[PDB]
Amino acid sequence: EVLFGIASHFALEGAVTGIEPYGDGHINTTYLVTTDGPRYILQQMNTSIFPDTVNLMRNVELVTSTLKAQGKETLDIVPTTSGATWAEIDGGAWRVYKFIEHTVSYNLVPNPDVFREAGSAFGDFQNFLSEFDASQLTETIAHFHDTPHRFEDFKAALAADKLGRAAACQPEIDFYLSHADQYAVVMDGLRDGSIPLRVTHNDTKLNNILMDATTGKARAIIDLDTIMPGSMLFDFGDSIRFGASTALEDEKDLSKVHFSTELFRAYTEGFVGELRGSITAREAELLPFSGNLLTMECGMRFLADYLEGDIYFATKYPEHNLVRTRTQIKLVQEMEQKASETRAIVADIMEAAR
């Protein structure tokens, strides 16, 4: 009823004939708009998590404009009748994207072939943003993949030990404390130039990768809300984290959790295969370690939350964040033990892409 009124705020190119809820997404509230013609995505943005709508949308407008300029499929913002990229409607923030037709998306990594395609999709994304000045982008979530900053947060949670949970998870604590010298590797490289500042997506889960409904080839990267400056190692590393595991983040059975070199190679094949002309030598040699770093970063965040009474991630039971942190530890250790195999894989893929 009011959804129709909202829709009237935007310069749609067909008469609206329907509006209903759409998607698996958690953070935004998404609606599908049917018209006598093209279809649209209408979103009410999360203003609690993303209070600075102007900066968020500016980031999106900059990145999507650059991709469109080059003829790349991306989120196409449908302006308001007054020409803005989003509209304020009763304290609520709303925006419209053209509906990307004829796609499918995956929730979990179904096999290596689809993972390789995820890799190519983000390698492509990076390739065509290779000349975009990433420093124009504002840091929508401060210090998001600044691992030394996360570790400080973790040490604060540990020192406070408000629930007295520390006593129950010393080996997990000691794991994070003992890896302290490794957390600053990529931030240091960004600061001293050895690592290129690039666009980072920061939510590289497959449900944000649209692939063609018929060919299964990557079509577009969506959900651009967490676009920020950073290293592409932050995105690659996190994709490895969740995607190259044989199990879920919260798998209780640790014998069921492994770092798969087969998935690592697949993602790397697609990614480097699209990014070979741009990726630096420093970046390439840090590909395997980026997996370590972002898994440790995610792992310490889970443990910090457990120690803080689970105030950041949703939980379903009391030891949930602890079970999550333990999968991340198990994965990092297998990453450390397979460093030989992973360095070889990268070197081989780097020459194959030539």
From Swiss-Prot:
GO MF annotation, one: phosphotransferase activity, alcohol group as acceptor
Temperature dependence per UniProt: Optimum temperature is 40 degrees Celsius.
EC class (word): transferase
A Pfam family reported for this protein in Swiss-Prot or TrEMBL: APH
Reactions this protein catalyses: N-acetyl-D-hexosamine + ATP = N-acetyl-alpha-D-hexosamine 1-phosphate + ADP + H(+)
SUPFAM superfamilies, alphabetized: Protein kinase-like (PK-like)
GO biological process: carbohydrate metabolic process
Keywords: ATP-binding, Carbohydrate metabolism, Kinase, Magnesium, Nucleotide-binding, Transferase
UniProt note: pH dependence: Optimum pH is 8.5. Stable at pH 5.0 to 9.5 at 30 degrees Celsius.
Required co-factors: Mg(2+)
Protein EC: 2.7.1.162
Domain Protein kinase intervals: 16-354
The UniProt record lists the keyword Transferase: yes
Role of this protein: Phosphorylates both N-acetylglucosamine (GlcNAc) and N-acetylgalactosamine (GalNAc) at similar rates. Involved in the lacto-N-biose I/galacto-N-biose (LNB/GNB) degradation pathway, which is important for host intestinal colonization by bifidobacteria. Also accepts GTP and ITP as phosphate donors. In vitro, can phosphorylate several GlcNAc and GalNAc derivatives.
PANTHER family: AMINOGLYCOSIDE PHOSPHOTRANSFERASE DOMAIN-CONTAINING PROTEIN-RELATED (PTHR21064), SLR1880 PROTEIN (PTHR21064:SF5)
Family to which this protein belongs: Belongs to the protein kinase superfamily.
Protein name per UniProt: N-acetylhexosamine 1-kinase
Organism: Bifidobacterium longum subsp. longum (strain ATCC 15707 / DSM 20219 / JCM 1217 / NCTC 11818 / E194b)
